[model samples]
Target: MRIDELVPADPRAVSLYTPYYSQANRRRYLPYALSLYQGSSIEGSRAVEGGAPISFVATWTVTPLPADMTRCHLQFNNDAELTYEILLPNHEFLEYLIDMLMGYQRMQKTDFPGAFYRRLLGYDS
Candidate 1:
């Protein structure tokens, strides 16, 4: 997915519909990330062999240090009443992270001439 295309769920709809309740009710609302990202899914897709697709959305909040202002903390909302945050020394870590991910998201150039000649020679199906 495009880095800039990361979307958010409707704040109004995030009205605690999925309570910290029974398994059946929780299963119905999860993968709750679908609400945060439109095309995110919990299917048996794989990017590599013997792997299942692990989909995730940035359902975390970030805060720069009030005193230092040079570092930041990323707090994730797991609804388990446990605190989870990534403290970083760089304030632009998010920007760098996005740029790095975009590098992997970009499509690579195909062997166009070789592919065309191979297909013409009935070497590919």
Candidate 2:
């Protein structure tokens, strides 16, 4: 999958113009674990370690609310399991994503059950 840079204006206004399953392409999706970091590469993909390609439209948009604003909006394809909107005021989102990706990356692909669970829940044994 391709990767790209994130911007703040993105989340300020986003709309899933198309259904994830209906969309066809490596970048098309409803915000799965990998889609969580659309522009940013997770690992194993073509854009490992923050490469730039701007795959899907997934990104974060930081909008400043009047009165001591600190929270930001994260936008992407909305799904039943995970919503595309996330609030990040003063937190390490990339760091958290890196840790999560790294943990799942270390899991052996041969272990079907383990890897499957890890991919689903974000970790393995």
Candidate 3:
């Protein structure tokens, strides 16, 4: 992924949604990223993975022009091979992204202090 193409999720983290082209399948794909570090040095964890069975969280229908400034969109994929698309304006996207990550932590019941939680909560910066 291009560094300049990424968007800041918060003061300490950055996120990106990039388009990929699959030559083998002759199809388009989208990948999501949540980089837990920003600034000149890489000081935290980065979550980099690809697709699966999809899920979405949005304040409303996502459009090129969103009616609400707080509107956000998120897509999750459970199928490892299928690329998932996520489109949203940055501000709300970061909010919901944090919410989703927190939700996953709650569901998994992982209480141990680690890199994942640190980055997710912006404690690493």
Give the clashing residue pairs of candidate 1, or none: none
- C-alpha lDDT score of every prediction, in listed order: 0.31, 0.32, 0.36
What does candidate 1's lDDT look like per residue over 13-123, in tens digits? 232222233345444332343343354322321132232222222332222234211122222232334322322222333344344234324433222245433532445
lDDT (Cα) of model 3:
0.36
lDDT of 1 at 85: 30
Which predicted model would earn the best TM-score?
3
- Evaluated at residue 20, the lDDT of candidate 1 is 36
Which residue segments of model 1 deviate by more than 4 Å?
1-53, 60-90, 107-125
Q: After superposition, how far is residue 81 of candidate 1 from its true place, in Å?
A: 21
CA error at residue 33 for candidate 1, angstroms: 16
Best by lDDT: 3
TM-score on alpha carbons, each prediction: 0.22, 0.26, 0.27
Q: List the residue pairs that clash in candidate 3.
A: 52-78, 52-79, 53-78, 53-79
Among all windows of 10 consecutive residues in model 1, the one with the lowest summed lDDT is 67-76
